[PDB]
């Protein structure tokens, strides 16, 4: 097996064939411009192109000093062209493919998502919002794992197109996202039960009330720089209305969620307890203020 197979091995998006096909397509007198043209023809994905170019520069012996210098110049040019779009996406090729498979989505889409995520600072919230409309919560968890994997990958690669500092922050934020998704899943299973049980006894809950709204409300509470029991109850009442059993249900649910929520999502363990205390206090307030 040659470099092309090394490149193609485990790489669900490049075959050793197309790489060899590319190297074979590039003549010894290929100008840097010629090289890029060919690479571009066979490979639309800048990541895969850059991959191809690496392959090409690398599969080219120094005997072909002019070609390699051309390929080097081509790749230098391609890299100059795409910078991170090529190099960053290239850096996380395998990751994108792994998770594309699990998600049954396109790896390139994931790399695009990834470059998107890594092309700028992104907070957890921004990541969640960036992902929610794109993925089921189940899949967001998977995507988050992907993002993490890709950034980890790039930080290890370094290079003038790895915004190393930036990726670090992004990974922090993506870990936060994962924590959030787990929390959302918590709510996914329990909210319906709560609402159905309320319903069974003729307690009407907002029909559009679902775990996400519940979870969202839950995470506003814990992300609140200045949460209170009143804010919590209010958050819950805003969420499910005022039926004592409903509010109690949700607060109970939030209370239970708190124990389950990742420490990442709290500035400290103290903050979690503080929130739990707030929720417990909310629960008390509900029953206290209950009349039925």
Automatic annotation (TrEMBL):
Residue ranges occupied by any T3SS low calcium response E C-terminal helical domain in the UniProt entry: 186-284
N6,N6-dimethyllysine sites (modified residues): 149, 156
Signal peptide span: none
Domain Hypersensitivity response secretion-like HrpJ: start-end pairs: 1-135
GO annotation, biological process: negative regulation of protein secretion; protein secretion by the type III secretion system
UniProt superkingdom: Bacteria
Single GO cellular component term: cell surface
Record PTM N6-methyllysine, positions in chain: 156, 220, 231, 271
Name of the protein in its database record: Low calcium response E
Gene, per the UniProt record: lcrE
